[PDB]
Design a protein around this ligand. Structure first.
Ligand SMILES: *[C@@H](CC(=O)Nc1cc2c(Nc3ccc(OCc4ccccn4)c(Cl)c3)c(C#N)cnc2cc1OCC)CN(C)C
Length: 307
């Protein structure tokens, strides 16, 4: 198949500044900062991940494989890697997404999120996923926690730590063991470790459900080990209070046992987009019409305008 001609940019440590810690994990620390390429008179808001010293050879390998994947995607609804830096520990430089993860955003701003935003986000995530399908990439971890918010009007899919580029002739990815987000996974993934674009569609439905409930936990209080039999008995997540049957039927279709009967991402774009043209017909939110969310140094330029 086609040669992957993505460029991987190796950055110089003196070209970026850490301004503030965003978060700390077992992997390393994420900083908010600025990337200032020498002589270009530009300043790019970035998230910088610095791996800790104690990082194993195995962990470094997985981080570099994820970097390889992020360097190979280029779409307005998929997060962009600016580059990496090979200091004592590896640093990864991504576009800053100032409003954070979408799961938190909907929990924290629920009294101001109207139907127009919710449906637009559905369109955008469907576009990101359709692009990934075109690239023969299966994400395997789609969820509201893994969507980032550049502005309230513009979201992007992130976290390619489980993502697989399907082999040239390969139709499905077969996984081995590992720690899995059961409650977002298609039944064939839980039972048989099979992943396809159609299994990502299932996860998309669950992600939509998260948004429409303003960040409820799916199958809340139910242990992960009971999920597969609940699903086999035909039970699914409930209709969110704000959803018309039009929107709920779409989620339900994403949760069919027959993977080939689930909608395609290209059809999800179309359907949510029809609804986005008349949003109050499809989502019923009290005070919808009065809801407002935020909207937009000298040489600052967003990563999206730095090409
Ligand atoms: C959600 C809160 C939250 O997401 N906070 C954030 C996060 C970001 C991030 N996130 C991020 C993710 C991964 C990164 O690395 C990428 C990588 C590349 C190659 C190999 C391995 N890993 C980095 Cl560096 C960052 C980014 C990015 N990218 C940008 N901006 C963020 C902002 C932000 O909040 C700002 C208010 C909380 N959970 C509970 C759901």
């Amino acid at each position: 198949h086609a040669p992957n001609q993505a460029l991987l940019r190796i950055l110089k440590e003196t070209e970026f500044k850490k301004i503030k810690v965003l978060g700390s994990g077992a992997f390393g620390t994420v900083y908010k900062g600025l990337w200032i390429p020498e002589g270009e008179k530009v300043k790019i808001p970035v998230a910088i991940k610095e791996l800790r010293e104690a990082t194993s050879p195995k962990a470094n390998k997985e981080i570099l494989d994820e970097a390889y994947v992020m360097a190979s995607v280029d779409n307005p609804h998929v997060c962009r890697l600016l580059g990496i830096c090979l200091t004592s520990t590896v640093q990864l430089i991504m576009q800053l997404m100032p409003f954070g993860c979408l799961l938190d955003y909907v929990r924290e701003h629920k009294d101001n999120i109207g139907s127009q935003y919710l449906l637009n986000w559905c369109v955008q995530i469907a576009k990101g996923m359709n692009y990934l399908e075109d690239r023969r990439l299966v994400h395997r971890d789609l969820a509201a926690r893994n969507v980032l918010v550049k502005t309230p009007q513009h979201v992007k899919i992130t976290d390619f730590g489980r993502a697989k580029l399907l082999g040239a002739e390969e139709k499905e990815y077969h996984a081995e063991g590992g720690k899995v987000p059961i409650k977002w996974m298609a039944l064939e993934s839980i039972l048989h470790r099979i992943y396809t674009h159609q299994s990502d569609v299932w996860s998309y439905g669950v992600t939509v459900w998260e948004l429409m409930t303003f960040g409820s936990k799916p199958y809340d209080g139910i242990p992960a080990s009971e999920i597969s039999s609940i699903l086999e008995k035909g039970e699914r997540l409930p209709q969110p209070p704000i959803c018309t049957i039009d929107v709920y039927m779409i989620m339900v279709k994403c949760w069919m046992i027959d993977a080939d009967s689930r909608p395609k991402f290209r059809e999800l774009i179309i359907e949510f987009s029809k609804m986005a043209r008349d949003p109050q017909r499809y989502l019923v939110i009290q005070g919808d019409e009065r809801m407002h969310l935020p909207s937009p140094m000298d040489d600052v330029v967003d990563a999206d305008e730095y090409l």
